[PDB]
Design a protein around this ligand. Structure first.
Ligand SMILES: *[C@@H](C)[C@H]1/C(=C/c2[nH]c(/C=C3N=C(/C=C4\NC(=O)C(CC)=C4C)C(C)=C\3CCC(=O)O)c(CCC(=O)O)c2C)NC(=O)[C@@H]1C
Ligand SMILES: *[C@@H](C)[C@H]1/C(=C/c2[nH]c(/C=C3N=C(/C=C4\NC(=O)C(CC)=C4C)C(C)=C\3CCC(=O)O)c(CCC(=O)O)c2C)NC(=O)[C@@H]1C
Ligand SMILES: *[C@@H](C)[C@H]1/C(=C/c2[nH]c(/C=C3N=C(/C=C4\NC(=O)C(CC)=C4C)C(C)=C\3CCC(=O)O)c(CCC(=O)O)c2C)NC(=O)[C@@H]1C
Ligand SMILES: *[C@H](C)[C@H]1/C(=C/c2[nH]c(/C=C3N=C(/C=C4\NC(=O)C(CC)=C4C)C(C)=C\3CCC(=O)O)c(CCC(=O)O)c2C)NC(=O)[C@@H]1C
Ligand SMILES: *[C@H](C)[C@H]1/C(=C/c2[nH]c(/C=C3N=C(/C=C4\NC(=O)C(CC)=C4C)C(C)=C\3CCC(=O)O)c(CCC(=O)O)c2C)NC(=O)[C@@H]1C
Ligand SMILES: *[C@H](C)[C@H]1/C(=C/c2[nH]c(/C=C3N=C(/C=C4\NC(=O)C(CC)=C4C)C(C)=C\3CCC(=O)O)c(CCC(=O)O)c2C)NC(=O)[C@@H]1C
Ligand SMILES: *[C@H](C)[C@H]1/C(=C/c2[nH]c(/C=C3N=C(/C=C4\NC(=O)C(CC)=C4C)C(C)=C\3CCC(=O)O)c(CCC(=O)O)c2C)NC(=O)[C@@H]1C
Ligand SMILES: *[C@H](C)[C@H]1/C(=C/c2[nH]c(/C=C3N=C(/C=C4\NC(=O)C(CC)=C4C)C(C)=C\3CCC(=O)O)c(CCC(=O)O)c2C)NC(=O)[C@@H]1C
Ligand SMILES: *[C@H](C)[C@H]1/C(=C/c2[nH]c(/C=C3N=C(/C=C4\NC(=O)C(CC)=C4C)C(C)=C\3CCC(=O)O)c(CCC(=O)O)c2C)NC(=O)[C@@H]1C
Lengths: 172, 162, 162, 172, 162, 172
């Protein structure tokens, strides 16, 4: 996998070129902005259970047929799996936030996920909703003004949203 | 690729857990260091042409025959003088990549892996490249933690060649 | 799914042999038992509506707050009262499935697997469900081996919840 | 895998429904009729060698080209494999009889067998004959009036035939 | 298939190396032997019809019933007399294949593998085939290393049958 | 795998036939000619490093883009792999020479190699050149009149060329 730094190095290595002044500045801004990034991971992480539980409450509220007998989330073991999937996807997202690059997420989680769910007959569309619900939950928690030093984290939140949206797309 | 950050994510991931606090603490650690190693990197990037040229000559000096000797592996020819200029360029570029990533990862992946095999196969003696490295180490013109960070990645390279 | 019969076939199959006599003897064994556990099952099936309703109220009684308490996990709301009625229904249905199959297989597969995780995630306390079980155990109205077989699958469930 | 009981439970679980009185009666008749089922498995089992040997004699008699040099049953090791295949298929059939459900057979044996033989260039049609020959042998042995208490096992024999025919189809 | 040569290549290959000298020495070894075992093979090939026929009768003699006995496994019938002629033919053909390849490989692969299973399944007694082998061993009419090489592959076969 | 002898046995076994006098003569000529075969393997083997190094020098001289940054042989680890691939292919060729049959080469090396390189985005055409360059090097070394007893090895060299060409085709 890659982090924001390695990504740029990788893009650079392949043109055989040193980093442009632009690039150096980009990474420095990332570094500068690093406390925010760290807070965001810490916060989403520390509430992972909650994010997952409440998005699942939500999804099943909106999509009851999943828990109608026969539904892809009927039976406790399928329910567990679903919840587990949601925690998995949340967990790889935190990784990507921490890295500033989607590659961990991509490679170790999104790759060939659509096909897996298709095989299983898990409705990808529904997964993608569960993902969206966590996103909105996690953004809110991450971006909570309380208990934190005031500053603008909006660019970070967009990045974060990016990874969640990216995951939702990989399975819709 | 191996950076401080990917190393952390890797630990969590292989244990299937969310990131720990110590992991977070490590990345913070990395961010604190990024400042200096980044200004070293762009320093090295800005007078690299200087450094490369300077480096070559310095090798040439130390090992005269490379200027003259039947051999594609030798910078006798002008073709070879290029190759060598290029090789040196490659080495410099990597220490910057390391400074940027905050570890040996990029040099491990783009240069160290296969280095033995390549030097062997192509009659490229390590001494040539270790001299070039000592040269750059002298004249990068860095002071402070920035020099620390740079010379660190350089010595790492010098080891690999011995 | 795990039944006496599949368990036998599984043994033979993992040893790549035809069925043994002891295996055959086991299935016979199962057939001998099927009689009673089947009349228990259809008994439970026939006055289940009774039993379910009865069961809910009995939980409600034992744990009053479930009637009133801010919470989607609570049968305060009428939505939740449904959910709970449904949950109880699910539990009953499973003990019948067990009676029919002649083992815990169906309950192991459709209910016990993931039960911890689900109760946890959704703020569903096990006590709620253990009361409901004791209630059904009392009033299934079974006597004889039929009651034995039923109460067996029930106690199994009660364990899982503790 | 599933047995006749689990099958019905599985069909039931997914409609989220208890068993209808019909269903209870069905399984009870199965149970009632259980001695026959047991005799059938015991008998076919106890003669497995014979069934296999004689069906193989037969098939090769009808299809000599299999044992013409070059034939898919020429050489002793291919012959052995063939015989082994026949015993395998017979063995998974007994399992299915004992379970009253084809699932064991299906899942652990028929699945993707056609494709295997095709790969190998074993003529599926010929396998399917070997299967048919065993069926007829095994029915006869199972349904032998001698040494057994008289009663009608004809419904059981049809079930049995079912599994054999099912296997023959999976490879023709 | 297992020959001296493939056995060597296999050793190198499983160690991921080029062929060694000892390996080369082995193949040379094989080439030195090929001469005799090849003239044995074509000897056996040229009066095989003799040998086969001769062999059958000789079995028939030793085991009279095979001429008469209700049984598809018996050469009572003329169909069976064929089968048996054919079987013997197969055995002879294999010892030639071995002589040609310079090891038991072809007989191991085309005959020995599954031999137990087949003899068993088809009520084919090994004695029948061991007699036929002793017969061929007597009258191949070979002398010298050529006979050595032949009788070697034959005895190998006789073992397998016991 | 097969050697020249086993090949003929295999072709024979499947027609169910003994070897024709032709066939016996063929193998005898092979045997007769065996010292040459052995010299050829020994020689190519003993210079494997050289063959590989010089063909690689050559290829990259002709195809510099491979070692332009981004090129499929840029970076030392990809360079190593390439060199390794060349040694692999050379090594399986020696095997085939020693056996007088391409099967070892075929089965354990050429099989599905095109597809591998395609996956990787290694230009098969370029591999096939590297192969051709080694061929010409190895023929020369094998067929060196110096340090060896004079005789005609031209038929052997054609065989050898065969295996190399065969490998080049398997990836172009
Ligand atoms: C958007 C995420 C919200 C925001 C963030 C924010 N944080 C700071 C400052 C800090 N964040 C930390 C956190 C850590 N440092 C570590 O090493 C670790 C690993 C355990 C963590 C979690 C720290 C120490 C600081 C500095 C101390 C402080 O609290 O001030 C800022 C200030 C700017 C900066 O980049 O430092 C901001 C803006 N603030 C918001 O309002 C968002 C809701
Ligand atoms: C069709 C299969 C033939 C048929 C069968 C048949 N059997 C019975 C009775 C019995 N079968 C058994 C066999 C077993 N019980 C076990 O626990 C085991 C495992 C080792 C076996 C093999 C037994 C004990 C009985 C009862 C004793 C008896 O022999 O009577 C019947 C009677 C009806 C019934 O269901 O019991 C029948 C009809 N009978 C035929 O004619 C078919 C050729
Ligand atoms: C084409 C390859 C060239 C050629 C070959 C050639 N060799 C011989 C003779 C010999 N080759 C060997 C080599 C070995 N014997 C072994 O057991 C081993 C394994 C270590 C090896 C490498 C030997 C012993 C001989 C005989 C002794 C000798 O050197 O004469 C000939 C002679 C004909 C023959 O088949 O023997 C030939 C023609 N000769 C050329 O000119 C080609 C360039
Ligand atoms: C009744 C005793 C108490 C009550 C029940 C209640 N449950 C929920 C939600 C769930 N119940 C289950 C149970 C199962 N689903 C299955 O598929 C199976 C196996 C067949 C079982 C046992 C599950 C998984 C859930 C969560 C998903 C769903 O809603 O179906 C609620 C609503 C929960 C919420 O937070 O929205 C309620 C009210 N709750 C009480 O207080 C009663 C004492
Ligand atoms: C939840 C909102 C939806 C859903 C989920 C669901 N999935 C399964 C099965 C699987 N889910 C995965 C996903 C992953 N495994 C990993 O290791 C990773 C990270 C790389 C991921 C993303 C996989 C592999 C499976 C199959 C293997 C397994 O079950 O562990 C189920 C159960 C399927 C079954 O019947 O067995 C469920 C229920 N299901 C829904 O209804 C939601 C819309
Ligand atoms: C002759 C010494 C005695 C005789 C022979 C006999 N054999 C059969 C049947 C078979 N013979 C073989 C042997 C092989 N098939 C192969 O592919 C190979 C390796 C190349 C061998 C060694 C086999 C497999 C069979 C069974 C299938 C077939 O018929 O080919 C018969 C007929 C058997 C039957 O039961 O119908 C006979 C008569 N039998 C004697 O009594 C002779 C003393
Ligand atoms: C017999 C009437 C016909 C025939 C059979 C034959 N098969 C092979 C090879 C294989 N057969 C199987 C089948 C299975 N393996 C299992 O574990 C199971 C149960 C799940 C089955 C059904 C497989 C997997 C193979 C390939 C692996 C193996 O050989 O064990 C052969 C030999 C093929 C070869 O040349 O290697 C033969 C001869 N062949 C005929 O001619 C009959 C029409
Ligand atoms: C300069 C100090 C001395 C010199 C250099 C020289 N090198 C070659 C050939 C090569 N140099 C490399 C090095 C790399 N390629 C990579 O991708 C990487 C990592 C980014 C590195 C470090 C390689 C692989 C080669 C061989 C392939 C190539 O040519 O690029 C030559 C020509 C070699 C030949 O034999 O034709 C020369 C002259 N040589 C000296 O004598 C200088 C003292
Ligand atoms: C060299 C002239 C060209 C080239 C080669 C190259 N290959 C890779 C990767 C692989 N090469 C193989 C081939 C084999 N592995 C085996 O075990 C065998 C024998 C059966 C063969 C033939 C394989 C499997 C790979 C992938 C696995 C691996 O790398 O070991 C690379 C590196 C690819 C990468 O980026 O990882 C290269 C560079 N590349 C060129 O540019 C030449 C035209």
């Amino acid at each position: 996998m890659l982090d924001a730094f390695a990504k740029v190095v990788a893009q650079a290595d392949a043109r055989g070129e040193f980093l442009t002044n632009a690039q150096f500045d980009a990474l420095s801004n990332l570094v500068k902005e690093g406390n925010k990034r760290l807070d965001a991971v810490n916060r989403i992480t520390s509430n992972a259970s909650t994010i997952v539980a409440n998005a699942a409450r939500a999804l099943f509220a909106e999509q009851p047929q999943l828990i109608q007998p026969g539904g892809n989330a009927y039976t406790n073991r399928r329910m567990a799996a679903c919840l587990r999937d949601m925690e998995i996807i949340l967990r790889y997202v935190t990784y990507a936030i921490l890295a500033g690059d989607s590659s961990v997420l991509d490679d170790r989680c999104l790759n060939g996920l659509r096909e897996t769910y298709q095989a299983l007959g898990t409705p990808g569309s529904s997964v993608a909703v569960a993902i969206q619900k966590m996103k909105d939950a996690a953004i809110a928690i991450a971006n909570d003004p309380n208990g934190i030093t005031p500053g603008d984290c909006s660019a970070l939140m967009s990045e974060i949203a990016g990874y969640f949206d990216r995951a939702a797309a990989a399975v819709a | 690729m191996k950076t401080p950050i990917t190393e952390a994510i890797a630990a969590a991931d292989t244990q299937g857990r969310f990131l720990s606090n110590t992991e977070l603490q490590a990345v913070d650690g990395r961010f604190k260091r990024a400042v200096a190693s980044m200004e070293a990197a762009r320093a090295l990037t800005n007078n690299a042409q200087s450094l490369i040229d300077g480096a070559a000559q310095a090798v040439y000096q130390k090992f005269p025959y490379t200027t003259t000797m039947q051999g594609s592996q030798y910078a006798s020819t002008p073709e070879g003088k290029a190759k060598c200029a290029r090789d040196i360029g490659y080495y410099l570029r990597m220490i910057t990549y390391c400074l940027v990533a905050g570890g040996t990862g990029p040099m491990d992946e783009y240069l160290i892996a296969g280095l033995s095999e390549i030097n062997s196969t192509f009659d490229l003696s390590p001494s040539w490249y270790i001299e070039a490295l000592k040269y750059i180490k002298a004249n990068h013109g860095l002071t402070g933690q920035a020099a620390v960070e740079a010379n660190a990645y350089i010595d790492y390279a010098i080891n690999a060649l011995s």
